[PDB]
Design a protein around this ligand. Structure first.
Ligand code: A1IGB
Ligand code: ZN
Length: 999
């Protein structure tokens, strides 16, 4: 295994280093506004050295933006695919590429056998070629890596199953910024090349000037270059026809034969190609081509030909095809051009490029880093969408976890087809897959479309719960009893965090209404976990036992809610009929643990929290509420940190241990505005008019709850209920955010330390890796905002502070010792990127965080020059507690004969840096050989020199292994037959996939 800490890779282009030297000057380049006047030597080209041009027709199809998936399908996409099918069929030299498998699957299932076979025909002959082959073309900023891999697996599985094809070239023309997570997943899924579009205009200029637009893109820690993927970055402002033929959009636009009810902004129309003009039109176009080719190292040129929802009408197919045919026939017949031009596919382009390299005509540069934050022009940085529609951003994470848990839970058994497991899982994967779209998780879609996304995710959550409950009943009922009704609710799910919602079951216990209640906890992670869990109960006199009837220590706290008296003030109210029972659930790796809640007066092993209101009846509750003037507060749970809070109930300092210092750590809410003159912030753009200013907090009500297992500080701020929860380690932060009214406002949460971070900070990419960022004072504020998909940190010689998130949001470190993360944004103006609206549809979201202060001076850190950072064990586990908590199940009935106490107590408890990211059964009951796929990710944690673990071999997890294969990440190809049927060890920062066959 490579060393990802000691050794700094050598690459031609390192993006952090690149950004440091770049001036980012927005100069007028001329007809190429953001470049220069391309010159080529016309004697470069002769009969020995021709330009080879691939004109690649395409149609960008959004699975939701202005319209819903179904709306666009009905209006646009179904017509495009019928025409493609007809036109390619009748025109054997015509070519077409296709990205979005969601729409292809939808269309293909509606075809008659005949059309099905004809369609297979034009795929087999290579005329219609699938690119990437994902369900969608996903967002790359906010998306979790697991979800990127999910949407990819979904489209490619569909392709392999229905078309017997697996794309090896990727096409990503539209995401707003590009992540190295994409080459990382794609190269582990058999890909050979990929294409990107949306990078900062100033980065395109810099690279274009050195012919570094094609590059071998490797991971920032990769010393060897094993991860490298060949990447083509297109050079110009857009993927549309004006911006794809060459440098001068005024010329290129004349070669979009659909604009003769569409027209050319530059006021020069296209003209039909005839014998009259062909020489002149050809000359104009090839000049364009040769200008573009000068930016690349080979004599092979990629010319994309299309636009959004293009190739819809029969006559668009003719006008495009026939005019370009006339051009090609003329160009290729005339030796003075020294050009071979034709219709081609993406993979055809890449093949010819690799032919040129293998012949030694070019050596390509190496690149590591990322392409965030993107700007299309002047100071219009697209950091807005790191935050837009934050409720759905959080919904993504919750759904992500429920599909994982549903697929793992049900993977253990084969299910009769009447249970409908395969169907529910299929729906849940597809819904979650669709939201990966660059108008889904991004928050850049119209309100009714966001509505559609939400309803779909909701149905997907319901489908996971139905699978999870059925699986749990099967796993913990004695086989001699197990007799299921697949439409029965054996368990209801209990979620303390989604939606946060006046739902949640109260368990109603009574000395003879119902005395005891069985609850089960599921642990999706492959090691033993202990975690505080909570349930709502109808009495404060409840005690906890395991199934063996051993006592478990518990605490009871009141249920509190916050009201806006509107008359007055934001105040808490306490329940008189529901209480919270809290205890530590111990749960096996990938396993289940049953507990019992029994009613009794005050039990032996249950304590009662106290309540202090700083500025209230509580039912059958033992400790009466106390009252107080606003004051500073210090709490400690267990031996864990001691935390001091302001008189406004905001964290002020943390003390790690009894004898360590009181470390200043201040939370502050601030607000950013929109511009006086200038451009207006929208769904995409963040255009603050100066540094944020502090929110006026007044004198708010601070609620303090103090218990032996769990304590917390909650405060009703204007817009935000803010809570710090203490369980013994790193606290959890919850914000209930209601931006409600406050137009042209962005609400930020900032941390202020004395940590001597300077200009350095660290943000993660897709929850997979942490990348070094440098704050740049030469760039505007919005350009120092980066995606925070799961966490961020600052550090000095001695001290780290890391914030872990349950939800993708935007964030920065805008001064030494600070971290900051946007909570919500409300926006009266459109930012003119196509959407037509601002963001005027906000709703209450519960944001969750963990807050880790640590001493790092005895940690093995990477050198000053390494572009990556690495989490500690504590910060890694805190992240895992946010994204993959314990699942909670309440038995829905009164008696559970058969009940067992635990599942998975024999499962190996693997090293903490290792996760079984996916467990998914791959075969229905009707197959003779059962097969299960596993995705394994091993992260890399700092060695701080800070435990008993067993070897985990996924091939042996289930009984009667007959075969085990190391596979691509999508499970679709074998990469190594494992003679042993034992899975090899995986390296730090690697992801591997195994498929186990069972007899
Ligand atoms: C015809 C409309 C123009 N087309 C677009 O503006 C395309 C769409 O595919 C959509 O995904 C949108 C993104 O939201 C923002 C970047 C540009 N995108
Ligand atoms: Zn798009």
């Amino acid at each position: 295994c490579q060393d990802v800490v000691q050794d700094v890779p050598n690459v031609d282009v390192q993006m952090l280093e690149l950004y440091d030297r770049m001036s980012f000057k927005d100069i007028d380049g001329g007809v190429w506004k953001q470049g220069w006047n391309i010159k080529y030597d016309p004697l470069k080209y002769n009969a020995h050295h021709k330009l080879k041009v691939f004109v690649v027709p395409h149609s960008h199809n959004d699975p939701g933006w202005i319209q819903t998936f179904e709306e666009y399908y009905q209006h646009d996409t179904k017509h495009i695919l019928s025409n493609a099918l007809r036109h390619l069929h009748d025109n054997p030299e015509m070519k077409f590429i296709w990205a979005e498998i969601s729409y292809f699957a939808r269309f293909y299932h509606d075809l008659g056998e005949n059309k099905k076979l004809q369609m297979k025909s034009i795929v087999k002959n290579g005329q219609l070629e699938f690119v990437t082959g994902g369900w969608v073309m996903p967002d790359e900023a906010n998306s979790h890596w697991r979800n990127v891999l999910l949407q990819l697996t979904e489209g490619q599985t569909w392709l392999k199953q229905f078309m017997n094809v697996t794309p090896t070239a990727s096409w990503a023309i539209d995401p707003f910024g590009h992540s190295p997570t994409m080459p990382y997943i794609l190269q582990k899924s058999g890909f050979k090349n990929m294409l990107i579009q949306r990078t900062h205009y100033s980065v395109k200029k810099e690279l274009a000037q050195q012919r570094q637009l094609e590059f071998l893109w490797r991971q920032i820690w990769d010393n060897k270059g094993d991860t490298a993927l060949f990447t083509h970055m297109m050079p110009f402002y857009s993927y549309d026809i004006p911006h794809t033929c060459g440098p001068d959009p005024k010329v290129c636009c004349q070669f979009d034969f659909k604009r003769m009810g569409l027209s050319c902004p530059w006021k020069v129309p296209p003209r039909t190609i005839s014998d009259q003009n062909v020489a002149a039109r050809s000359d104009l176009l090839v000049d364009q081509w040769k200008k573009k080719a000068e930016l690349y190292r080979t004599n092979v040129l990629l010319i994309p030909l299309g636009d959004d929802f293009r190739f819809k009408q029969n006559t668009e197919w003719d006008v495009q095809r026939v005019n370009y045919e006339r051009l090609f026939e003329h160009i290729n017949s005339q030796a003075h051009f020294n050009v071979q031009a034709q219709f081609g596919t993406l993979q055809e382009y890449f093949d010819a490029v690799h032919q040129a390299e293998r012949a030694g005509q070019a050596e390509f540069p190496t690149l590591s880093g990322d392409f965030f934050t993107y700007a299309d022009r002047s100071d219009n940085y697209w950091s807005g969408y790191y935050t837009s529609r934050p409720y759905h951003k959080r919904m993504d994470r919750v759904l992500m976890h429920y599909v994982r848990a549903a697929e793992m839970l049900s993977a253990w058994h084969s299910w009769d087809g009447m249970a409908r497991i395969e169907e529910r899982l299929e729906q849940a994967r597809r819904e979650l897959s669709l939201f990966q779209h660059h108008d889904g998780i991004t928050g850049t879609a119209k309100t009714h479309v966001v509505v559609d996304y939400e309803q779909r995710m909701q149905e997907a959550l319901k489908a996971c719960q139905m699978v999870m409950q059925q699986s749990v009943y099967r796993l913990l009922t004695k086989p001699s009893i197990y007799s299921p009704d697949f439409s029965f609710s054996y368990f209801t799910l209990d979620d303390s965090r989604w939606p946060g919602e006046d739902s949640r079951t109260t368990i109603i216990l009574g000395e003879d209404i119902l005395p005891s209640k069985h609850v089960v906890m599921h642990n999706t992670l492959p090691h033993w976990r202990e975690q505080l869990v909570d349930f709502y109960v109808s009495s404060p006199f409840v005690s906890v036992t395991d199934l063996a009837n051993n006592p478990v220590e518990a605490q009871v706290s009141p249920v509190w809610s916050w009201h806006h008296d509107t008359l007055t003030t934001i105040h808490p109210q306490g329940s008189t009929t529901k209480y919270r029972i809290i205890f530590k659930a111990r749960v096996p790796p990938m396993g289940l643990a049953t507990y019992v809640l029994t009613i009794s007066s005050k039990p032996e092993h249950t304590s009662y929290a106290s309540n202090l209101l700083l500025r209230l009846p509580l039912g059958q509750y033992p400790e009466d509420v106390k009252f107080g003037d606003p004051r500073e507060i210090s709490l400690r749970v267990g031996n864990g940190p001691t935390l001091a809070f302001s008189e406004q109930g905001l964290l002020k300092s943390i003390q790690l241990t009894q004898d360590s210092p009181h470390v200043p750590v201040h939370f502050k809410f601030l607000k950013y505005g929109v511009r006086s003159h200038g451009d207006r912030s929208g769904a995409y753009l963040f255009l603050p008019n100066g540094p944020a200013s502090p929110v006026e907090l007044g004198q708010p009500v601070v609620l303090v709850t103090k218990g032996k297992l769990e304590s917390s500080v909650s405060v009703g701020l204007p817009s935000v209920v803010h809570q710090t929860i203490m369980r013994g380690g790193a606290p959890e932060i919850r914000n209930l955010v209601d931006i409600g009214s406050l137009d042209n406002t962005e609400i930020v949460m900032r941390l202020e330390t004395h940590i001597d971070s300077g200009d350095i900070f660290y943000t993660d990419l897709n929850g997979l890796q942490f990348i070094k960022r440098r704050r740049l004072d030469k760039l505007p504020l919005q350009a120092n905002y980066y995606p925070i998909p799961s966490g961020m940190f600052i550090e000095d010689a001695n001290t780290r502070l890391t914030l872990l998130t349950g939800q993708p949001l935007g964030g920065s470190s805008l001064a030494s010792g600070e971290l900051e993360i946007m909570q919500d944004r409300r926006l009266a103006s459109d930012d003119e990127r196509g959407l037509g609206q601002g963001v005027l549809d906000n709703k209450p979201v519960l944001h969750i965080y963990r807050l880790v202060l640590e001493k790092v001076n005895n940690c093995v850190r990477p050198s000053e020059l390494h572009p990556a950072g690495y989490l500690t064990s504590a910060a890694h586990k805190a992240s895992q507690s946010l994204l993959d908590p314990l699942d909670k199940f309440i038995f829905a009935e009164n008696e559970w004969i058969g009940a067992q106490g635990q599942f998975g107590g024999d499962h190996p408890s693997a090293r903490e840096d290792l996760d079984v990211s996916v467990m998914r059964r791959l075969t229905k009951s009707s197959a003779k050989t059962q097969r299960v796929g596993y995705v394994l990710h091993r992260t890399n944690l700092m060695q701080c020199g800070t435990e008993h673990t067993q070897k985990l071999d996924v091939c042996h997890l289930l009984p009667n292994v007959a075969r085990c294969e190391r596979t691509t990440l999508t499970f679709l190809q074998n990469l190594e037959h494992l003679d042993g049927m034992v899975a090899p060890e995986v390296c730090p920062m690697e992801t591997a996939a195994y498929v186990s066959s069972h007899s």
